[PDB]
């Protein structure tokens, strides 16, 4: 229902490294500029009626100072990816950040952490297998729609638009199942340089296409 | 070039026919010539696998091509849900696959009533049955295992996806299989896509 027609944008945030290298700066400087650019994109999305923004870094700190900021901007924060590998002391900080913002009615921000598109499909398959083994589910009852409701973000609007910054033309095992019908938009802009007009240019391409 | 498996979303036959001031079937006919050209180019340049997606009448056309593909040592495979198709067409698919299955040159996969989500689902249903029989535990299911249950698992991974016709979408073509593939979009309409276009795509992959 916004004029650009875009409910859910996903972004592969590539370019932090060469951005830093361009300035004779080490990579960490680029990742810091990258975090700034995330803040900028989150604010842009929320102000342009986007329901969901899903971000892929192609964190251990970020999730606390940012969380207060996100929360103040009425953003609902979710983390997608294999977070079982993580230590359960900051696994705790993840769940705390999620429940703290779970009530917010603005943008839903999904952050990919130890996320893979193939993994995403496989964890959903494992849940279906568990139901099969418990006797609930019959194998031939499994269809697209059912698997669809077991992959990440099934409860949000389908992904309308995938943006990849940084010049490369691949998905790199980001969303796979979820992008079957998504518009794909590639720009050479390095992620730290990606701004409101770049984002606006992406949405306008989506609307025009 | 290093490109072992190319997949192509062949879009634009209809729009092309219109620009020519001709009917759609004329576009399809030019589409088929472009397929021949793409298949020969792939085999000529040492590409191991070529996977083609049209975006029951169309695979019938390839039946008269089978003799020639076989002589060119091409392995022909149809991927997708052919259970739909009339049993006569299904048997001819079966026969053409069997005739060429032992060939060792280009493997040419034709997507017919294919969908990427469907493809994954078929593998899921297979794994699910193994679970139901106690032959497989849920937590034992991993990427490698599901990979062995989706189309083309025995071929080189897809290196490059070409989509003609100007749209920037996968359109529920290969999904699992293109996780790390280079994606190449061109405005050229599929009946115009020639050897130079194809090489242009290989060049993009080369960097």
């Amino acid at each position: 229902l916004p004029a650009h027609g875009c409910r859910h944008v996903a972004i592969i945030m590539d370019g932090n490294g060469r951005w830093a290298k361009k300035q004779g700066k080490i990579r960490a400087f680029g990742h810091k500029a990258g975090a700034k650019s995330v803040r900028r994109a989150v604010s842009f999305a929320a102000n342009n009626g986007i329901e969901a923004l899903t971000l892929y870094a192609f964190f251990v700190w970020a999730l606390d100072s940012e969380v207060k900021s996100l929360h103040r901007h009425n953003v609902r924060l979710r983390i997608i990816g294999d977070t079982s590998r993580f230590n359960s002391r900051l696994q705790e900080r993840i769940r705390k950040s999620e429940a703290l913002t779970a009530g917010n009615t603005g943008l839903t921000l999904n952050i990919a952490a130890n996320y893979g598109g193939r993994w995403d499909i496989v964890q959903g398959v494992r849940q279906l297998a568990e139901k099969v083994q418990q006797g609930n589910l019959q194998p031939d009852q499994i269809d697209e729609e059912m698997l669809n409701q077991h992959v990440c973000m099934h409860e949000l609007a389908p992904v309308d638009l995938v943006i990849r910054t940084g010049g490369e033309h691949r998905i790199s095992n980001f969303l796979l199942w979820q992008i079957a019908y998504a518009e794909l938009y590639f720009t050479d802009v390095l992620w730290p340089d990606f701004d409101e007009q770049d984002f606006e240019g992406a949405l306008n391409a989506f609307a025009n296409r």
Side-chain angles (χ1 to χ4, degrees), chain A residues 1-60 62-84 86-88 90-209:
Chain A
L1 221 63
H4 47 72
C6 217
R7 298 167 71 203
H8 187 171
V9 179
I11 306 187
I12 302 183
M13 296 171 306
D14 197 8
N16 292 345
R18 32 200 180 293
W19 184 87
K21 194 167 175 291
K22 268 180 52 175
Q23 304 203 349
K25 302 234 172 204
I26 70 173
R27 289 193 52 180
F29 189 85
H31 291 307
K32 290 195 285 196
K36 293 192 186 336
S37 183
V38 169
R39 282 248 195 132
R40 181 203 296 149
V42 168
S43 277
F44 181 92
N47 287 335
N48 285 261
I50 289 176
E51 293 179 15
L53 177 64
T54 298
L55 300 179
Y56 183 71
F58 176 80
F59 172 77
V60 55
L63 198 110
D64 211 316
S65 68
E66 300 299 325
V67 170
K68 306 203 188 303
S69 189
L70 287 171
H71 184 52
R72 278 142 196 173
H73 289 64
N74 197 30
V75 173
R76 181 170 60 152
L77 172 71
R78 307 237 158 269
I79 309 293
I80 65 175
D82 183 20
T83 48
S84 291
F86 283 89
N87 137 64
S88 65
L90 43 88
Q91 279 188 56
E92 183 67 15
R93 307 237 300 196
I94 291 182
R95 51 171 303 275
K96 269 187 298 182
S97 296
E98 287 183 330
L100 158 68
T101 52
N104 299 342
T105 57
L107 174 77
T108 306
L109 180 63
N110 310 293
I111 308 299
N114 195 35
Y115 176 91
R118 288 189 182 171
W119 165 88
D120 191 346
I121 298 164
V122 164
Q123 64 74 32
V125 172
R126 287 192 188 103
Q127 290 181 63
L128 292 178
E130 276 289 354
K131 292 168 171 189
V132 170
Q133 187 185 57
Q134 294 165 333
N136 304 323
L137 180 65
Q138 297 303 298
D140 57 306
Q141 286 175 336
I142 303 180
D143 51 16
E144 289 189 36
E145 182 61 59
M146 181 178 291
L147 181 49
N148 193 60
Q149 299 198 46
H150 288 76
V151 308
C152 288
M153 302 188 302
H154 62 85
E155 75 276 9
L156 306 177
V159 172
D160 300 289
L161 176 71
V162 178
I163 296 164
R164 175 158 187 158
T165 62
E168 297 305 280
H169 288 49
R170 332 174 160 266
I171 307 310
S172 296
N173 196 22
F174 186 24
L175 309 168
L176 291 174
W177 179 278
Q178 297 92 329
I179 66 179
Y181 301 104
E183 176 83 11
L184 309 175
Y185 182 86
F186 303 98
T187 169
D188 291 341
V189 192
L190 309 182
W191 175 245
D193 290 328
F194 185 90
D195 63 24
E196 293 83 353
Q197 303 197 31
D198 296 308
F199 207 154
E200 178 177 40
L203 297 171
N204 295 342
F206 172 84
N208 294 134
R209 299 176 65 85

